[PDB]
Amino acid sequence: PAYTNSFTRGVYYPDKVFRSSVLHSTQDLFLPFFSNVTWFHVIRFDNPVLPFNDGVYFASIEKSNIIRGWIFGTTLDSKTQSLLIVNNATNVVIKVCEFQFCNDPFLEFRVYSSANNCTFEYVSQPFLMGNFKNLREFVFKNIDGYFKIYSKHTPIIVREPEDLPQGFSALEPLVDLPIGINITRFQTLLALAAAYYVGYLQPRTFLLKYNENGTITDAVDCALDPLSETKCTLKSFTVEKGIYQTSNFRVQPTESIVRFPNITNLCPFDEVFNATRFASVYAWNRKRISNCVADYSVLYNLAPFFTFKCYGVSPTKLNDLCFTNVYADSFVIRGDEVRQIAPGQTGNIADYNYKLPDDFTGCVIAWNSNKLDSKVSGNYNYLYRLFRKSNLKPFERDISTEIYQAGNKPCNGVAGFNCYFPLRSYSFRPTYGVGHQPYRVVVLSFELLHAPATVCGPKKSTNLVKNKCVNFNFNGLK
């Protein structure tokens, strides 16, 4: 193949706003000035599959209307949605469907053999179509779903070779097709001496000048060269003599050195999630998990997680932070009693069985256990405290069983009338509603102190390259 230079071509209208005698700075997807576009020439056939990254600037030095359509798609094998645009002689057929394209689709509908169901079809009559040569520039973009197509027709006087003209041509918006199917590749459709200059778009900032009629006369790329930045940073197409500050030369990083500690043993998250039935509420099992590699991802397959709320940290991004010492507190509660396990919320369990501090920085996770911790007999093997004198202190376990006094009579340990027992049992029946079903709840409390961290996620540590500007990703410092 060959390559040509884009002499400041591919500047369409960013929005649908009319402006005159202004200098507008837009930040849309355009074609960079003086770029290296492809020069696929067809005399020999040339119709290869080209990637669709962000946008396509398809030029056409065309005679007798050789190129007559386009095909966009991801797989192009009748397994994913694909867009087909044809223009035979009189109209443009634009349809997104599930066609089966052959190895070399060309134009007598030979480009496909099967036609599945479609949900969109446009026959917008206007066909988008011998002294001078024809130049048919088309900008195809897929932003916010709607497939935008900009078109521009130009009479070009053929020079010595076949080189893109050196001039400005503002492309006019054509359609606003309601699309959004994934599109990553495309191909052209010819009809059996022409050539196209398909290019690729990328984000950039352009300074556009509007005349008194509202048509863009020229453009500045604000990133092509030193002077262009000076013109943009000064909002003027003509800069005077002097020195101007435009930007800052910041050296970009090279790599992403991690340098995490030397920890290989897997985290004991299996004996606290796939253990025996469970522990009780007033005797929640607390275990210190130190010197481990906490892979929370495995916690999503060994046990289906319901609403996951983390206080102080985000639910994700837990594999790149290394805590010092974590504590797992496991117990079982009712369905409606899961709201009380939270900093600030009160109730029956939040003040008598398990209280979280107001500055709790950790993750609580509860999941229904109506399949393993239930049976049709009356589930009375889980106890909880209902009566106590004062509220439970944050992170404190009450193992005592002193009798409760609800009146003024000196019971002195009789456990009868007005001397209700402080510990009662639940009732987990498989026929009750979801509000009364048992839920296993584990609270992972983290600690971030000035100490060598010993529990992080599964991130492979890299080598230490010095004397180079790199991205450091230490235990708690990025």
Binding site: P226, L227, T230, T238, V239, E240, K241, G242, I243, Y244, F249, V251
Partner: peptide
């Protein structure tokens, strides 16, 4: 540094706080 678009288009660039080692080439204060 631009001598003026009416004169020519050749401009010069000055990086501040460098030593011509991490960016005709002339080192100043």
């Amino acid at each position: 540094i631009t001598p003026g678009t009416n004169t020519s288009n050749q401009v010069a660039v000055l990086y501040q706080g460098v030593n011509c080692t991490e960016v005709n080439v002339f080192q100043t204060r």
